[PDB]
Design an enzyme around this catalytic site. Structure first.
Site, PDB file in Angstrom:
ATOM      1  N   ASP A 124      31.305  38.499  39.445  1.00 50.32           N
ATOM      2  CA  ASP A 124      32.704  38.292  39.067  1.00 50.32           C
ATOM      3  C   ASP A 124      33.715  38.687  40.163  1.00 50.32           C
ATOM      4  O   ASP A 124      34.754  39.286  39.880  1.00 50.32           O
ATOM      5  CB  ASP A 124      33.006  38.990  37.724  1.00 50.32           C
ATOM      6  CG  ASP A 124      34.268  38.465  37.049  1.00 50.32           C
ATOM      7  OD1 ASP A 124      34.757  37.377  37.416  1.00 50.32           O
ATOM      8  OD2 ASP A 124      34.786  39.151  36.149  1.00 50.32           O
ATOM      9  N   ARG A 128      41.617  39.855  41.132  1.00 52.33           N
ATOM     10  CA  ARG A 128      41.844  40.689  39.940  1.00 52.33           C
ATOM     11  C   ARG A 128      40.834  41.830  39.827  1.00 52.33           C
ATOM     12  O   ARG A 128      41.094  42.836  39.167  1.00 52.33           O
ATOM     13  CB  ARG A 128      41.821  39.842  38.657  1.00 52.33           C
ATOM     14  CG  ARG A 128      40.477  39.154  38.392  1.00 52.33           C
ATOM     15  CD  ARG A 128      40.359  38.514  37.016  1.00 52.33           C
ATOM     16  NE  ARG A 128      39.065  37.837  36.919  1.00 52.33           N
ATOM     17  CZ  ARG A 128      38.833  36.589  37.327  1.00 52.33           C
ATOM     18  NH1 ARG A 128      39.813  35.842  37.820  1.00 52.33           N
ATOM     19  NH2 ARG A 128      37.623  36.078  37.222  1.00 52.33           N
ATOM     20  N   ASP A 142      34.948  46.371  39.280  1.00 53.34           N
ATOM     21  CA  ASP A 142      34.479  45.697  38.068  1.00 53.34           C
ATOM     22  C   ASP A 142      33.049  45.151  38.135  1.00 53.34           C
ATOM     23  O   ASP A 142      32.794  43.986  37.810  1.00 53.34           O
ATOM     24  CB  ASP A 142      35.463  44.613  37.623  1.00 53.34           C
ATOM     25  CG  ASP A 142      35.275  44.227  36.171  1.00 53.34           C
ATOM     26  OD1 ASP A 142      35.228  45.139  35.322  1.00 53.34           O
ATOM     27  OD2 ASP A 142      35.164  43.019  35.879  1.00 53.34           O
TER      28      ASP A 142
HETATM   29  C1  LIG Z   1      47.751  52.010  38.307  1.00 50.90           C
HETATM   30  C2  LIG Z   1      46.613  51.067  37.914  1.00 50.90           C
HETATM   31  N1  LIG Z   1      45.315  51.372  37.987  1.00 50.90           N
HETATM   32  C3  LIG Z   1      44.579  50.330  37.571  1.00 50.90           C
HETATM   33  C4  LIG Z   1      43.196  50.153  37.457  1.00 50.90           C
HETATM   34  C5  LIG Z   1      42.214  51.073  37.854  1.00 50.90           C
HETATM   35  C6  LIG Z   1      40.856  50.791  37.960  1.00 50.90           C
HETATM   36  C7  LIG Z   1      40.091  49.643  37.752  1.00 50.90           C
HETATM   37  C8  LIG Z   1      38.711  49.666  37.955  1.00 50.90           C
HETATM   38  S1  LIG Z   1      37.759  48.210  37.671  1.00 50.90           S
HETATM   39  O1  LIG Z   1      38.238  47.087  38.542  1.00 50.90           O
HETATM   40  O2  LIG Z   1      36.309  48.498  37.940  1.00 50.90           O
HETATM   41  N2  LIG Z   1      37.977  47.795  36.117  1.00 50.90           N
HETATM   42  C9  LIG Z   1      36.962  48.177  35.122  1.00 50.90           C
HETATM   43  C10 LIG Z   1      39.099  47.162  35.759  1.00 50.90           C
HETATM   44  C11 LIG Z   1      39.371  45.846  36.153  1.00 50.90           C
HETATM   45  C12 LIG Z   1      40.564  45.230  35.767  1.00 50.90           C
HETATM   46  C13 LIG Z   1      41.486  45.930  34.986  1.00 50.90           C
HETATM   47  C14 LIG Z   1      41.209  47.243  34.605  1.00 50.90           C
HETATM   48 CL1  LIG Z   1      42.312  48.156  33.647  1.00 50.90          CL
HETATM   49  C15 LIG Z   1      40.026  47.853  34.988  1.00 50.90           C
HETATM   50  C16 LIG Z   1      38.094  50.850  38.357  1.00 50.90           C
HETATM   51  C17 LIG Z   1      38.855  52.003  38.569  1.00 50.90           C
HETATM   52  C18 LIG Z   1      40.236  51.978  38.369  1.00 50.90           C
HETATM   53  N3  LIG Z   1      41.168  52.924  38.503  1.00 50.90           N
HETATM   54  C19 LIG Z   1      42.356  52.412  38.195  1.00 50.90           C
HETATM   55  O3  LIG Z   1      43.402  53.052  38.222  1.00 50.90           O
HETATM   56  C20 LIG Z   1      45.474  49.311  37.210  1.00 50.90           C
HETATM   57  C21 LIG Z   1      45.126  47.920  36.663  1.00 50.90           C
HETATM   58  C22 LIG Z   1      46.760  49.782  37.417  1.00 50.90           C
HETATM   59  C23 LIG Z   1      48.088  49.020  37.191  1.00 50.90           C
END
Ligand SMILES: Cc1[nH]c(CC2=c3cc(S(=O)(=O)N(C)c4cccc(Cl)c4)ccc3=NC2=O)c(C)c1C
Length: 264
Positions: A124, A128, A142
């Site tokens: 994936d 994003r 992710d």
């Molecule tokens: C300030 C902040 N932080 C994050 C995401 C974020 C992560 C996403 C991931 S991720 O890409 O692995 N993941 C699971 C994920 C992928 C997309 C959206 C979201 Cl909420 C999470 C892993 C660690 C993170 N630490 C973060 O702060 C976001 C989307 C924002 C606006």
């Protein structure tokens, strides 16, 4: 034992939501280090703990680390200040240059070069799904235990699997099988996202019709400020023969060269 975090060590703040997935939810947490905690509100426990061992052992500046697992199990991940790469490049507050955007793409390639060397297929890859920290370092994310679906719009059903069709290689659309070479295809699309500053790919296409659109002899068009050699790299990533696509090592090489020709 190195993967497990004691329940005493972690505080997860359910009032402050970072994002809602399909199978779970991620929150601000405290470990004093600021973290992100993925909840899974099931699957094999044996396969879960062993997946967390592979992930914890992944160490690269352009790959998201797993901090650990708290024992439904909670997945503890580093906090990423600037969020996802796609939203970052769409933000009217930030002003990345052409060089900066190529540089983001180089970092991802290095992250993917690392993952490919561990025989790990991302499945994936997309802007994003790449995160930025406080130093604006891009981390491929992710994947593994962290894997979910957060922007539902870009996944289409049918096996009733919900799949990111607009990022998928021809053969993956046909067989639903993913490889590092299909990750390479996804990386070309990610490069395109960067050079258009987060535009949706193939807007006037709908879902699995994408296969018919591609078989028409079509590829995403060259963004205006995308360098000609960078567009040629995208086309190589979208080679109809999977085995003729560049490796991530080749991509790191070719992109580092393009990057070096720019100032500022
Ligand atoms: C300030 C902040 N932080 C994050 C995401 C974020 C992560 C996403 C991931 S991720 O890409 O692995 N993941 C699971 C994920 C992928 C997309 C959206 C979201 Cl909420 C999470 C892993 C660690 C993170 N630490 C973060 O702060 C976001 C989307 C924002 C606006």
């Amino acid at each position: 034992q190195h993967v497990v975090i004691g329940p005493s060590s972690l505080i997860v703040h359910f009032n402050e939501v970072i994002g809602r997935g399909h199978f779970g939810c991620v929150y601000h947490g405290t470990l004093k280090i600021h973290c992100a905690v993925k909840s899974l509100n099931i699957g094999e426990v044996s396969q879960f703990l062993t997946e967390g061992i592979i992930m914890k052992d992944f160490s690269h500046p352009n790959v998201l680390s797993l901090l650990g697992i708290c024992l439904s199990p909670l997945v503890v991940l580093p906090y990423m200040k600037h969020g996802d790469l796609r939203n970052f490049i769409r933000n009217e507050t930030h002003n990345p240059t052409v060089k900066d955007l190529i540089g983001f793409g180089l970092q991802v390639a290095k992250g993917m070069k690392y993952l490919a060397s561990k025989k790990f297929v991302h499945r994936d890859l997309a802007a994003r799904n790449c995160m930025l920290d406080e130093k604006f370092t891009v981390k491929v994310a992710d994947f593994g235990l962290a894997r979910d679906m957060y922007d539902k719009e870009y996944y289409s059903v049918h096996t009733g699997a919900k799949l990111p069709v607009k990022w998928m290689a021809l053969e993956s659309l046909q067989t639903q099988k993913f490889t590092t070479k299909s990750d390479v295809w996804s990386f070309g699309v990610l490069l395109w996202e960067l050079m258009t500053r987060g535009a949706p790919p193939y807007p006037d296409v709908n879902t699995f019709d994408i296969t018919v659109y591609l078989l028409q002899g079509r590829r995403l068009l060259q963004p205006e400020y995308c360098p000609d050699p960078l567009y040629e790299v995208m086309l190589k990533c979208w080679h109809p023969k999977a085995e003729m696509r560049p490796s991530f090592s080749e991509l790191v090489s070719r992109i580092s060269a393009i990057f070096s020709t720019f100032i500022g």
